[PDB]
Amino acid sequence: MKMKKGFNSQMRSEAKRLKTFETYDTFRSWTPQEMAAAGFYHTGVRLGVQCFCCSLILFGNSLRKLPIERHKKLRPECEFLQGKDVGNIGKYDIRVKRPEKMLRGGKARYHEEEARLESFEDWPFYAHGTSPRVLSAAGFVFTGKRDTVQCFSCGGSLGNWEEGDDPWKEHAKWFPKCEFLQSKKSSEEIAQYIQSYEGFVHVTGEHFVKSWVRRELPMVSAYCNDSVFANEELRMDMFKGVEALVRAGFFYTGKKDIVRCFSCGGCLEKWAEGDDPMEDHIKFFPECVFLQTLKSARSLSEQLRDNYTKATFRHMNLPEVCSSLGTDHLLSCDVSIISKHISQPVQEALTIPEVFSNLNSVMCVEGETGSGKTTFLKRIAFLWASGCCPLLYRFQLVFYLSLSSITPDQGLANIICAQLLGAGGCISEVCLSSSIQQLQHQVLFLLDDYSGLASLPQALHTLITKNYLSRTCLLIAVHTNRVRDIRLYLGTSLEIQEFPFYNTVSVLRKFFSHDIICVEKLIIYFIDNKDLQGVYKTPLFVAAVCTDWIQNASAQDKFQDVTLFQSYMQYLSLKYKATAEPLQATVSSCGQLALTGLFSSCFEFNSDDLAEAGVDEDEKLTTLLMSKFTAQRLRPVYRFLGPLFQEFLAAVRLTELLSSDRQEDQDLGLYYLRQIDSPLKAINSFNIFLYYVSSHSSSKAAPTVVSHLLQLVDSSFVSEHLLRLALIFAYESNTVAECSPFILQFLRGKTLALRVLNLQYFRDHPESLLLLR
Ligand SMILES: Nc1ncnc2c1ncn2[C@@H]1O[C@H](COP(=O)(O)OP(=O)(O)OP(=O)(O)O)[C@@H](O)[C@H]1O
């Protein structure tokens, strides 16, 4: 209840307000990214988080209100930029201003040291944990603005000082060529000081991506609030007075009349009189968004190709996640990563804002098939091009290349010009080779859809196999347990663990205005908790539930589980329509396995049974959309997405078998239909197998199974007859109530007790209710 409130926790900014959520459960509405962007950190008292400037006991976490709204509503006296040690992604150096420019009179006097001591009257209260004496002992002087300090005789500015950061390691790390440093400290201790988290970085205040950013006030919900990025957004199509004024909280994505604020908008036609705050952001944009954002040689060639890469990464083509229909630029939810280390099995979970700082050499990212590799690579490329995340400023060039058979060993220049630039980039082989060589650790390749060394081109092969004479940094997307070739070559392997539920609920929240469907999904989901995992193993379930809104709400209020599963399966069928032949096999071949276990009462499904089922024979991609490597001690197990998914896949296999006219691919279906042989078997199996063999409009399969249900005959006795006939009539009326019933149910099952025991659909009653009922 009561914990040490104290005061401003000066040791707590973002990128440290996010790392505190590794001890946070993955099932709740608000996200660590959004909560941390609100200046909150996870103490761990029971479940709650508190702010770093205005300590708040915020435990309850609702859905209709974002953390910014709660923080403003409860204690509104800490967000007037009165002073907060807010660090953004914050590459720790971006302050490069005045390398030799106008200081406040050169308070170091260009010689003196006690002058550096005395220049710190207005040293703010953000730091202070850092002693001004130790800062001044290394030739540092306070330039005057926002706790950034400049060192003379080399003119280097460092900011975002935190607790315990000794300004002697850092002065060595960021400027080895600082004359004062070589004058005082020997060339031996500096190598020891090099040991830090950034790989090979140097003085990189000059770089073609830079864009100075403000104090990153917490009213910045997420990216796209820098008022300079949003301006160059709409230099493409909204160019043929209105434009510059539209940047009162807007940016362009789409077809010249769909311009989006941080929530949504554009539902009005432009070029009329039309003041941009029209209808005050059209009806406040429901919930009065952010108080109107709070009241408003060949170096030339490589720079030119840098500009083209930035332009083609900011084009509307790349930033499109949740690629179903809509108008999307607002998603920033990240994927959790835990990086296994080369030698021993240590997990060591990372965070997205900190993983960028460790990019050193050839890197691989794991991940289940359809789990967010292409998205993550596109996000990092975009964030480089959308230059406001500072950590990515160290790369002068980034390249996204999908090695999906477009590369039969032809050449790197040809593959980079025809995939990224487009009709404009004539970057020659020699130009690209020289750019790679001189820009050693400032070129980041993002390779996707990996196959193997044999398929890479010559230059890419050299860059991936040596990484000694080139120093280029690469990130390759691969499949889990399918990266067995570059084990010896890579450092800092990475893996996409899972997709937590807060990301799913955040994406659901953003896409919807009628936010009663999402809450219904929340309640109707934590009551099962058996399919808690698996279903959210991939972001494709979010896309499936979103595209289920092509007809109505995703909470149709009628046995939600079967609709959810069918929506998922239909979305799988839709996405891979280009290569649907193996998927149709993967759903069938794997699906039959579930049927084999539907009645044998086993869900572990060890490896040797998979061969009998007839799936994974080629270790193919899609077979991981429906199973996971649950255990890896020995003889890895293969568990599906919960017993309910057992049921649904077994049902779809049974329907396909009893629907196919292949005679002896159907006798097996009848055999699997045979084991149900008693009313208790018509209950215990059909408690969970009821709406799954019936849901599908199995025209051919309906008569055989309804006949089998009828032929079982050869209070509790009467009761089971009543339930059995209820099942049979419901099943037969689900799809077609003409062919099978008029010749089948007229035989045996007709019973009722008082008035409404046979209140089903009304047709011609029997002669006299089976002559005995
Ligand atoms: N943060 C996110 N929010 C919502 N959906 C996401 C997010 N990240 C990824 N996705 C979803 O992930 C899907 C793409 O996944 P992914 O790139 O893993 O497929 P893939 O088969 O690995 O493709 P490739 O093999 O080409 O990399 C997209 O349809 C997108 O909807």
Side-chain angles (χ1 to χ4, degrees), residues 320-324 331-335 367-377 379 400 402 404 448-450 477-478 496 499 503-504 506-507 511 538-540 542-543 571 575-576 621 625:
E320 280 316 311
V321 300
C322 276
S323 307
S324 87
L331 294 174
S332 87
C333 51
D334 276 300
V335 298
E368 301 326 289
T369 186
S371 166
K373 296 159 249 14
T374 221
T375 290
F376 191 51
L377 304 190
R379 266 188 222 277
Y400 173 99
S402 73
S404 72
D448 195 69
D449 274 341
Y450 182 76
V478 288
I496 302 193
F499 206 70
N503 276 6
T504 289
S506 73
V507 179
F511 263 117
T538 53
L540 314 171
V542 182
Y571 177 82
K575 180 193 296 312
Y576 297 79
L621 281 295
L625 281 74

